Every structure is written in structure tokens, then in C-alpha cells.
Swiss-Prot record, chains A, C, D, E:
Major location (coarse): virion
Subunit structure: Homodimer. The homodimers binds to the viral RNA via an operator hairpin, but also to many other RNA sequences in the viral genome; this interaction probably shifts the virus from the replicative to the assembly phase and ensures specific encapsidation of the viral genome. Interacts with the maturation protein A2.
Keyword list, A-Z: Capsid protein, RNA-binding, T=3 icosahedral capsid protein, Translation regulation, Virion
Entry's localization field: Virion
Record annotation: effect of changing residue 32 to A: Decreased RNA-binding to the viral operator and loss of repressor activity
Protein name: Capsid protein
Recorded GO MF terms: RNA binding; structural molecule activity; translation repressor activity
GO CC list: T=3 icosahedral viral capsid
Protein family: Belongs to the Leviviricetes capsid protein family.
Outcome of swapping residue 75 to A: In strain: QB_1 and Qbeta_1_FR
UniProtKB/Swiss-Prot annotation, chain B:
Any single GO CC term annotated in Swiss-Prot or TrEMBL for this entry: virion component
BP terms from Gene Ontology: adhesion receptor-mediated virion attachment to host cell; symbiont-mediated suppression of host cell wall biogenesis; symbiont-mediated suppression of host peptidoglycan biosynthetic process; viral release from host cell by cytolysis; viral release via suppression of host peptidoglycan biosynthetic process; virion attachment to host cell pilus
Localization of this protein: Virion
Impact noted for substituting residue 359 to V: In strain: Qbeta_3_F and Qbeta_3
Protein name per UniProt: Maturation protein A2
Source species, domain of life: Viruses
Keyword NADP included in the entry's annotation: no
Length: 132, 419, 132, 132, 132
């Protein structure tokens, strides 16, 4: 549907964190939409990117790419302006076949989320731990 | 939202044009304004007055959005853009600069730009009485005028298949070991005998024997691609004629309480009917590229004839089998355009363009020199899609039947080159 | 933590779908864990892969890679055995800097999930639609 | 007269068979009209051909040629598409002299039909039998 | 925001001049929007072009380019159709750094306008005069 303000509740380890994302427009070249938090400095502002794709002579498969960019502001650099320190990269992709059905895709969508809420990944993500 | 206004699904998740909507669109009502406000640069009543006032008008025009999509036939022409336009008494933007000098104190100059008005124009007509007869007359001369090119290409494609039946013997000669038959074919190519006599490899002898043969096939497939596209343009038969006509109009009052303006505009009532000739069953299965493109055919043909290859240490035997397999696949793809070809789509587009006209100036009966120029913005565009003919006379099946079995024998020959 | 049976509720467009994943062990070569549904044919069985990484002379950043593989069984092929038809590929990666903090990562984890539940992506994913 | 849809009743051994023929146009080269049943595949569709002629320096006589082509569809060939099997050829010709009158011709037309309904030809045609 | 009809008052040396600009769409290749007066001949019609940019491996800075094209119609060329005579080119660009703040940019926007209304530039622009 239409790019809109996207509010998000239940965020962060607390789950009391909330975030809104304004539509940033769409880069027509790569054909990729953009979403962002409204901050002060766009360089500091959180970014969310989604894209679709269509099969070509190069590839017969659909690609759905989602990337998230969350920098780390250094408030006091010893200078009057904050500066980017660390840049968190969150990337998600999807592949499908021209005959892919709806529920299959839908099935993929939820389960990925459930994993993200699974106690497995949290140690993997938060504490950077392998499967043991 | 997965289905656009011009696309339809299928049984195998194929995106084809929706013929239900593409033939007859939906009439959309237009409520917006094109140019409701025009400006005046000049003087009147011996006083500087620059104001903006709306004139008469009204917005009732039925329009449909254009659609440009991929064709519905392999190696075919673009689909017709079916757009319905309802005439509302098309207005022309009046740009007229008039300069009058009379009296002793009554002198003013003002230019009225972008002044729209309404005339009386014929909304419908019919030219089929002079077009349909002339339409079937070109069919008789088509066999004499273009028949030479058709028969010439038929002889150039048959010789290609003959070369393909001969080179299969040299390839298999290395397989079982019959090298005696190889030396009989090589000697029938060169004028003299200069072949290498040094004892080399077993497969290296196939390269030397086919040296002139590689250059022969290269020239065949080169110019064939150009002639293949030349004959596709002849299938679209479109004929027409223009005739002169004059349209009279009156009741123009652009200069309120000063004068009236009249004139004459000459139009050209033209008509042309096009027809489409393609596969009857071709428009049932298609996707957004599934086939082998033709933009690289001119480059990929010389990729094997050149003495320089990158597959020598890459198992050439696998590349050779794949090369012939790709040739038969493309030949089978083009071979599906001659099986049964009949009239599939038809359309009749009528339009009236604009020509040079003249404008006469007058002020309540006095002659005055007036120089103006006008242009056309909207025109008649209604392409009515239908399938029917008043007197149908066409036969192209037997003419192209001789081309169908030629590629069939070639496609069945490559099936004997398996592993 | 330890590889375990991972039960998942609220799956698919319905959300009544449930899935369990048994620990498949870990390939030590690439150092990647594996999880799977317990089906009949492993080739048919759903797969879930997670991995961590550690910075080397080649890269100073942590990588967390998660891939999901959900084939499409053809029950009747005209043959006695089912066969793989379409293969759904779901891939997710993560990048972090040696100085990356906990909450930043945690912040990333939730928000990605929220997006997956956002009405935006569902049309993007399920109906394959761009941002309009 | 004009090529038209030609409906035919009382067809086949039953005589309950009916057939329609659409005008196929006229090949101008040989100057021969064509008629056909409307089927699916034109190759499968029944064909009817009629032609007139005019005397030339080569021949002083009128020729009227009528040929009928009725293939035999093989529905299941073991392949997805039907294929032509047997091709029935029915050919009829006529010769006349520039002084040929109307009723003479008319006389020819009917009697040929009557023969086709005669009990003689049916065994000759249907059962392939000579005159005994 | 959305491309719209852009009305402009207070134009020209008079300031009684007004202009409207219809959205012309956006060329996706260069990724540049287009606006125009609605005239008769598009070649004659005034054009307005705006574009944004995003930093790449080639440049780390944002570019905002605005070009204006105002031809000069020759009404009577001695021919039935007007013709382009002189083509006025008005070009404006902007550069910014990823850390550029809002008010800085806003500060730039107004002051440029004020200059355009300053008595300095008018002689520079209108009468083509240097700074003396």
C-alpha cells in the first residue's frame, strides 16, 4: 500500500521503545523505497529501505530486499556537532519462484518474525553467541 | 493490486494482456480543467487594464489511459494502443494580434491569447466505401511485387539445412572411429589438396577439414536476421486516403462591445484501417522474457567461427553439444510462427488533422490587416477494435507451408546429437 | 543457549499455524548451526540456519547470518515419490562493530520483527508490491 | 453469391449430423475460395474449396473444381496436442463448353446429388464395394 | 511533497506577472522532476527542473540542482509556426554535507531569495552590471 507514517511499538529489550518512520520517497533508479525516523540530522536519522523486483532475462526469481541502517551518534565529539560513530547494518532478503504461492510466502513472513522473538536468536543477536 | 489494468493472469502464473479490457476500455469522465485562465497583454479603452476573466467553456470529455506493454506474439509488432476519445467540439487556442488605426483619438492595441471557443464539427463519418475496395486490390499485386523477395529467402534457408546434414558425419567420425568417411568430405570442399599430413590428435583433424565451412554458415545466419524482420513488416496491411474539406463556423464574440471576429478553417478528413496477422494460438502463453533474445544473435554467431576460443581447456566436447542444442532451440522458437497464421486482431482508426488555413479580419464591415497563427492541441483519436471484414480475401497458409517442414527436419536432426 | 526443540506459534497468514524445529547439529567447517522441522524426507523438511562470526584480519566486523529454506513438495508427480518443486529462500544478515553495544543490537532485533508485522511489508511480501 | 456461413443439415449415415462452414476468404493467386468449419486447430478443421475458371488460349472449356479435406484427429497421441492421422480427400470437378446451356448444367448438378443418395454409391463409398 | 500546480504571484519587474506550473512527471533515469507552464507548444512552454541526490562512493555530499529554461518565441518568422529564438538558462545548485543540519539549509534558502530581491543583483541581472 501507500508509503505512510509507520508507528512501531514494543521495541528494544524493554519493549517500551516506540518508533515512527516517515515516508522518504522512492529512488526510481534502483526502484527502492525509503523510510526514516524524523530526527534532526538525516545522517543521524534511522533509515529503512524496502524493494521489490521482477524476473528478467538475468533472473527468473523475485527478490525482496530490506535493509536497515541505524548509526550511532556521538553527541560530544569535542566539537559543536555530533558525528557518526558506528553504523549498524541490518539486511534481509527474499527469493521466490514465479510459481510461488501466497501462503508459502505468508508462511515465510511470520516464522522469520517468530524466530526474532525466539529465545535462540536473542543470545545470538544481543550477546553474540553461537548455538551452544 | 497484483493485476494492473492491462494484465491478466493464467494457469501457470503467466502475465498476459487482458483481452476483455484491452479491446473495449472503460469510459472515464473528466472533471479537471486544462487551461481555464488566460492572460491579456495590451491596452484597451485608452487605459491600462490587466485583469483575468474566465470565458465560456465546459468540461465533458471521455478519455482512456494509454497502455504500452510487451507484445503478445514472439518476434511480433507492438500491440495497438486502444484509446477511446469522445469529441466535445474541440477548441483551438486563438492567438491573434490585430492593430487598427482609425478616428482621431480611438486607438488601442490588445492581444487575446489562448481563447477557446466552440464550433460545429462532424463527430462521425464513414470512408469504407473507398477504402475497403482499395484494400483488397493490393493483395493481388503483393504476390508480384514482394513475391520475389519471399521466394529468394526460401531458397537461401533450404541450403542451410543441407549443410547441417553433412557436418554431422564429421563430428561422429571421432566417436566410433570411422575416419575414412571424414577424408571424403574434406576433399570435396577445397579446390586442391593442401591438407596437413602430420600425425596429430584425433579431434584436431576436424578443425582443418571444416575451415571454409565455418565461414559459409556465418554469412548465412548474418543476413538472414535482417530479412527475417523485413517480411514481418509486410504482414501489417494498412491503406488509406485523405480528402479535402472545409468547415464553417460562426457566433464568435471575443471583443465585447468593440467588434466581432470570423474566419474559416480547413481540415483534412482522413481514414485508415490497419489489420494484424499473427498466430491464432500464439497469444495464449507468454511471460516477461522466457525466450532467447535476438539483440545478441549478431554477436553470438561469430563467437564460434573465430579461431580464438576460451573453451579449449574447458571440455570442448561439452561446449560443442551445447552449441548445437542452442541452435535447434532457437530454430524451434522461430518455427512456431508459421504453423497456422490467420487474422487475429483488427482496428479502425479515424482522425482529422489540421492544415494551413486563412483568417480574415473585419471591424463592423471595414477591412483590416490581421496576422494570426494557431495550433491544434486535441484531435480525433478513436481506434475501434473489432474482428470482421466486409469481403475477406486472403490466403497465406500454403505459401508459408513450405517453410514449416524445413525447420521441423532440422529440429529433429539435432535430437540425434545427444550424449 | 543450547540448541533445542524450537516451537513456534502464530504462523502464516492465519496465525494458527505452528511449527517445531529440531536441532540438526552444527557444521563445524563453516561453523553454522542447523535447525529443521521433523518431516519425512529431509530434502522436503524445512531448514533453518544461524551463524555467528568473529572479526579477523579480513574483516573487523561481526556477521550474524540467518537463512531459511522452505521447499515446495509436489505430492503427486506421476511417480511414487514426492519431489522438490520450488525452493523458497529467506536470508537475513547482520553487521556490527566491535564497539557495538547491547541495546543497539537489541534495538535492531525487535524493530525488524515489528516491520515483519507491519502492514507495509505484508503487501510487499505476500502480494509482491512496491511502496505505493 | 457472397461467401457466407453455410449450415448443413442431414449429414452422415445418421443424417442427424449438422455442419457449419465459415468463409475463409479467397486465395487470389489460384483464384480459389475456401470454406471451413470453425474448430480449434485450423489444421484439424474441415476444409471446403471451390473454384471457377475461364477459357484461355490453353483451354476453351470452363472448369469448376471442388475439393473437400477432412482430416482425422488423434486426440491422445501420448502427447499434449492432437495430431493429424488420416486425411480424407474428396475431389469433384466439372467441365463445360462455352456454348453449354443453363439447364444442362443444372441437370448435371442435381443428378450427381441423387447418385450420392442412391443406394448404389453408398456401398461403393461406405463399404468400398464394386458394382456387384 | 507531491508535484502539484504551482502558482506564482509577484513576477517580473512589474510584480503583477503571475505564472502557473503543471507537474510534468519525473524522468526516472536521471531521477529529475519537471514542471512547466501550460502553453500551446511544449518547446515554447517554460520549463522548471528540480532534482535531489544522495551520496555515493563517488561523492559524499548531497546535490540539489534546479534549472530553469525560458525560451523566446518568435511569433512571426515569416512562416506559419512560431520558432525558438533565444533560450534563457537559469541554473541553481546546492551542496551539503551528510552532517548538514536543517536550519543551516533553511538559512541558505531564504538568504538566496533575499539577494534576488536585493537592489544589488537587479542591476547585475537586469542591466548586466558589475559591482560598481
Amino acid at each position: 500500500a501507500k508509503l505512510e507514517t509507520v508507528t512501531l511499538g514494543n521495541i528494544g529489550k524493554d519493549g517500551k521503545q516506540t518508533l515512527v518512520l516517515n515516508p522518504r520517497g522512492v529512488n526510481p533508479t534502483n526502484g527502492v523505497a525509503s523510510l526514516s525516523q524524523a530526527g534532526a540530522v538525516p545522517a543521524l536519522e534511522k533509515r529503512v529501505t524496502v524493494s521489490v523486483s521482477q524476473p528478467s532475462r538475468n533472473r527468473k526469481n523475485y527478490k525482496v530486499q530490506v535493509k536497515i541502517q541505524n548509526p550511532t551518534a556521538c553527541t560530544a565529539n569535542g566539537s559543536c556537532d555530533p558525528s557518526v560513530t558506528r553504523q549498524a547494518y541490518a539486511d534481509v532478503t527474499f527469493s521466490f519462484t514465479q510459481y510461488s504461492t501466497d501462503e508459502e510466502r505468508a508462511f515465510v513472513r511470520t516464522e522469520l518474525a517468530a524466530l526474532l522473538a525466539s529465545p535462540l536468536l536473542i543470545d545470538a543477536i544481543d550477546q553474540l553467541n553461537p548455538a551452544y | 493490486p497484483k493485476l494492473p489494468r492491462g494484465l491478466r493472469f493464467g494457469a501457470d502464473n503467466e502475465i498476459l494482456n487482458d483481452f476483455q479490457e484491452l479491446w473495449f476500455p472503460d469510459l472515464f469522465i473528466e472533471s479537471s480543467d486544462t487551461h481555464p485562465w488566460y492572460t491579456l497583454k495590451g491596452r484597451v479603452l485608452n487605459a491600462h487594464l490587466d485583469d483575468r476573466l474566465p470565458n465560456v467553456g465546459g468540461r465533458q470529455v471521455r478519455r482512456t489511459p494509454h497502455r504500452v506493454t510487451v507484445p503478445i506474439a514472439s518476434s511480433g509488432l507492438r500491440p495497438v494502443t486502444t484509446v477511446q476519445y469522445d469529441p466535445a467540439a474541440l477548441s483551438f487556442l486563438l492567438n491573434a494580434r490585430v492593430d487598427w488605426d482609425f478616428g482621431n483619438g480611438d486607438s488601442a492595441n490588445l492581444v487575446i491569447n489562448d481563447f477557446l471557443f466552440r464550433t460545429f464539427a462532424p463527430k462521425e463519418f464513414d470512408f469504407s466505401n473507398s477504402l475497403v475496395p482499395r484494400y483488397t486490390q493490393a493483395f493481388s499485386a503483393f504476390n508480384a511485387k514482394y513475391g520475389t523477395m519471399i521466394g529468394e529467402g526460401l531458397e537461401t534457408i533450404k541450403y542451410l539445412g543441407l549443410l547441417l546434414r553433412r557436418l554431422r558425419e564429421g563430428y561422429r567420425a571421432v566417436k566410433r572411429g570411422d575416419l575414412r568417411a571424414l577424408r571424403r568430405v574434406i576433399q570435396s570442399y577445397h579446390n586442391g589438396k593442401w591438407k596437413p599430413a602430420t600425425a596429430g590428435n584425433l579431434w584436431l583433424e576436424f578443425r582443418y577439414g571444416l575451415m571454409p565451412l565455418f565461414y559459409d554458415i556465418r554469412d548465412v545466419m548474418l543476413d538472414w536476421q535482417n530479412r527475417h524482420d523485413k517480411i514481418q513488416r509486410l504482414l501489417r496491411f494498412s491503406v488509406g486516403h485523405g480528402e479535402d474539406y472545409v468547415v464553417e463556423f460562426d457566433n464568435l464574440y471575443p471583443a465585447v462591445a468593440y467588434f466581432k471576429l470570423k474566419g474559416e478553417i480547413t481540415l483534412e478528413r482522413r481514414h485508415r484501417h490497419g489489420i494484424s496477422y499473427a498466430n491464432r494460438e500464439g497469444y495464449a502463453v507468454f511471460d516477461n522474457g522466457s525466450l532467447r533474445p535476438v539483440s545478441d544473435w549478431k554477436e553470438l554467431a561469430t563467437a564460434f567461427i573465430n579461431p580464438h576460443e576460451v573453451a579449449w581447456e574447458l571440455t570442448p566436447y561439452s561446449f560443442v553439444v551445447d552449441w548445437f542444442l542452442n541452435v535447434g532451440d532457437i530454430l524451434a522458437q522461430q518455427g512456431q510462427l508459421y504453423h497456422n497464421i490467420d487474422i487475429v486482431d483488427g482496428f479502425d482508426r479515424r482522425d482529422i488533422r489540421l492544415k494551413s488555413f486563412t483568417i480574415k479580419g473585419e471591424r463592423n464591415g471595414r477591412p483590416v490587416n490581421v496576422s494570426a497563427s494557431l495550433s491544434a492541441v486535441d484531435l480525433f483519436y478513436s481506434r475501434l477494435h473489432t474482428s470482421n471484414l466486409p469481403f475477406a480475401t486472403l490466403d497465406l497458409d500454403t505459401t508459408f507451408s513450405s517453410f514449416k517442414h524445413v525447420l521441423d527436419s532440422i529440429f529433429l536432426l539435432t535430437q540425434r546429437v545427444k550424449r
